Enzyme design. Structure first.
Site, PDB file in Angstrom:
ATOM      1  N   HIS A  51      -2.020  -9.776  -6.581  1.00  0.00           N
ATOM      2  CA  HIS A  51      -0.602  -9.437  -6.528  1.00  0.00           C
ATOM      3  C   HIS A  51       0.224 -10.387  -7.387  1.00  0.00           C
ATOM      4  CE1 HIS A  51      -0.861  -6.264  -3.547  1.00  0.00           C
ATOM      5  NE2 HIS A  51      -1.643  -7.032  -2.809  1.00  0.00           N
ATOM      6  N   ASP A  90      -4.084  -1.948  -5.171  1.00  0.00           N
ATOM      7  CA  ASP A  90      -3.032  -2.952  -5.043  1.00  0.00           C
ATOM      8  C   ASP A  90      -2.276  -3.145  -6.366  1.00  0.00           C
ATOM      9  OD1 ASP A  90      -3.380  -3.371  -2.324  1.00  0.00           O
ATOM     10  OD2 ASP A  90      -4.666  -5.083  -2.508  1.00  0.00           O
ATOM     11  N   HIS A 101      -9.986  -1.149  -4.045  1.00  0.00           N
ATOM     12  CA  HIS A 101      -8.770  -1.563  -3.356  1.00  0.00           C
ATOM     13  C   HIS A 101      -7.907  -2.476  -4.223  1.00  0.00           C
ATOM     14  CE1 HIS A 101      -6.040  -2.321  -0.012  1.00  0.00           C
ATOM     15  NE2 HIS A 101      -5.972  -3.550  -0.494  1.00  0.00           N
ATOM     16  N   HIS A 122       0.813  -1.219   0.000  1.00  0.00           N
ATOM     17  CA  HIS A 122       0.000   0.000   0.000  1.00  0.00           C
ATOM     18  C   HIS A 122       0.853   1.278   0.000  1.00  0.00           C
ATOM     19  CE1 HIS A 122      -3.397  -2.619   1.945  1.00  0.00           C
ATOM     20  NE2 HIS A 122      -3.232  -2.881   0.662  1.00  0.00           N
TER      21      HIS A 122
HETATM   22  C1  LIG Z   1      -8.063  -7.260   9.814  1.00  0.00           C
HETATM   23  C2  LIG Z   1      -7.864  -7.716   8.366  1.00  0.00           C
HETATM   24  C3  LIG Z   1      -6.812  -8.814   8.303  1.00  0.00           C
HETATM   25  C4  LIG Z   1      -6.424  -9.226   6.878  1.00  0.00           C
HETATM   26  C5  LIG Z   1      -5.600  -8.382   6.135  1.00  0.00           C
HETATM   27  C6  LIG Z   1      -5.211  -8.703   4.842  1.00  0.00           C
HETATM   28  C7  LIG Z   1      -4.371  -7.839   4.134  1.00  0.00           C
HETATM   29  N1  LIG Z   1      -3.781  -8.097   2.945  1.00  0.00           N
HETATM   30  C8  LIG Z   1      -2.875  -6.990   2.523  1.00  0.00           C
HETATM   31  C9  LIG Z   1      -3.442  -6.330   1.276  1.00  0.00           C
HETATM   32  O1  LIG Z   1      -4.350  -5.517   1.313  1.00  0.00           O
HETATM   33  N2  LIG Z   1      -2.663  -6.538   0.217  1.00  0.00           N
HETATM   34  O2  LIG Z   1      -2.851  -5.925  -0.975  1.00  0.00           O
HETATM   35  C10 LIG Z   1      -3.067  -6.151   3.750  1.00  0.00           C
HETATM   36  O3  LIG Z   1      -3.549  -6.964   4.795  1.00  0.00           O
HETATM   37  C11 LIG Z   1      -5.653  -9.906   4.277  1.00  0.00           C
HETATM   38  C12 LIG Z   1      -6.477 -10.754   5.010  1.00  0.00           C
HETATM   39  O4  LIG Z   1      -6.928 -11.942   4.509  1.00  0.00           O
HETATM   40  C13 LIG Z   1      -6.834 -11.986   3.084  1.00  0.00           C
HETATM   41  C14 LIG Z   1      -6.856 -10.411   6.299  1.00  0.00           C
HETATM   42  O5  LIG Z   1      -7.671 -11.250   6.998  1.00  0.00           O
HETATM   43  C15 LIG Z   1      -6.906 -12.327   7.558  1.00  0.00           C
HETATM   44 ZN   LIG Z   2      -4.076  -4.271  -0.584  1.00  0.00          ZN
END
Ligand SMILES: CCCc1cc(C2=N[C@@H](C(=O)NO)CO2)cc(OC)c1OC
Ligand SMILES: [Zn+2]
Length: 300
Positions: free
Chosen positions: A265, A242, A238, A79
């Site tokens: 990604h 990304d 979002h 991010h």
């Molecule tokens: C509180 C949210 C936690 C969380 C963050 C993410 C997350 N991914 C990263 C993202 O947005 N990458 O582009 C940032 O943190 C992913 C998750 O599952 C897919 C997730 O739940 C376990």
């Molecule tokens: Zn993201």
């Protein structure tokens, strides 16, 4: 001249790491022209540098990482990198006293504000763009992502979560890319996670930084966050956020049209490397004023 960009002054910010849940301190530094984006861990001695490179990217369930020649990693770059891409920041040093960048609010907006608080400095050196000159396409089953030539900056993203909380009217988003558009349309779109996954991971001592304050949280039914979504179509926005971060791992803004269907990604980086590997599919371009033309070449 369209000039390269860095920061006016060093700035700092503190936030929680998604993985450790511990407070992390982030420092952003100005850097001279043609140095690129450098991530650095200062919790290690000697500190380790991670130059943003498409081939240095490692993906995981919770984040994207940069890895060094010795399997050492810095995490949660996705991010912040989108914010750098959005503001066209060509040169900068990013330091953290921990193994991961702070998650902040799950979007890129806090990073944008931090960058604005630092101030932008245009250097006396031509900003190099990667221009798409061939259509390149990658696939993964029904998923795909493509770049095709286009005199500008465009993104078109489609998702398919099938989740009750996502209406088909909010599956797709397309926009012409600029700094202003990134900030006002994309920057604030947050990541998301399922409550079950979050609680499961945290029962294993993982994703300890996960909370309502750093992500959209949903169950199998609805969005649980008190104030709901920031956009009706925050999820797709979002994914675009990304992708923007993914593409900027080449260290340059890209002139072309990016289109994706259920990409991520891994597939986004795969596209990036595919383009870069195909030498005739891209080129470096710079822009200057008529006056800057060598006083010699003004020759009919
Ligand atoms: C509180 C949210 C936690 C969380 C963050 C993410 C997350 N991914 C990263 C993202 O947005 N990458 O582009 C940032 O943190 C992913 C998750 O599952 C897919 C997730 O739940 C376990
Ligand atoms: Zn993201």
């Amino acid at each position: 001249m369209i000039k390269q960009r860095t920061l006016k002054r060093i700035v700092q910010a503190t936030g929680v790491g998604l993985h450790t849940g511990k407070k992390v301190t982030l420092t952003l530094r100005p850097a001279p022209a043609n140095t690129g984006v450098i991530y650095r861990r200062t919790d290690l001695n000697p500190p380790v540098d991670f130059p943003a490179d498409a081939k240095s990217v490692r993906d995981t369930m919770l984040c994207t990482c940069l890895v060094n020649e010795h399997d050492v990693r810095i995490s949660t770059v996705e991010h912040l990198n989108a914010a750098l891409a959005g503001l066209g920041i060509d040169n900068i040093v990013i330091e953290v006293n921990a193994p991961e960048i702070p998650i902040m609010d799950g979007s890129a907006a806090p990073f944008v504000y931090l960058l604005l608080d630092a101030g932008i400095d245009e250097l006396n050196c031509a900003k190099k763009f990667v221009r798409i000159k061939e259509t390149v396409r990658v696939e993964d089953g029904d998923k795909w992502a493509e770049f095709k030539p286009y005199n500008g900056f465009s993104l078109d993203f489609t998702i398919d979560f099938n989740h009750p909380a996502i209406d088909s009217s909010n599956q797709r988003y397309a926009m012409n890319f600029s700094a202003d558009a990134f900030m006002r349309q994309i920057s604030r779109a947050r990541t998301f996670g399922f409550m079950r996954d979050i609680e499961y991971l945290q029962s294993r001592g993982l994703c300890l930084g996960g909370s309502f304050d750093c992500a959209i949280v949903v169950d199998d039914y609805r969005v649980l966050n008190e104030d709901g979504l920031r956009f009706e179509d925050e999820f797709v926005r979002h994914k675009m956020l990304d992708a923007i971060g993914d593409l900027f791992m080449c260290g340059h803004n890209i002139i072309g049209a990016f289109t994706a269907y259920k990409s991520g990604h891994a597939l986004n980086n795969k596209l990036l490397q595919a383009v870069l590997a195909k030498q005739e599919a891209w080129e470096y371009v710079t822009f200057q004023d008529d006056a800057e033309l060598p006083l010699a070449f003004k020759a009919p």
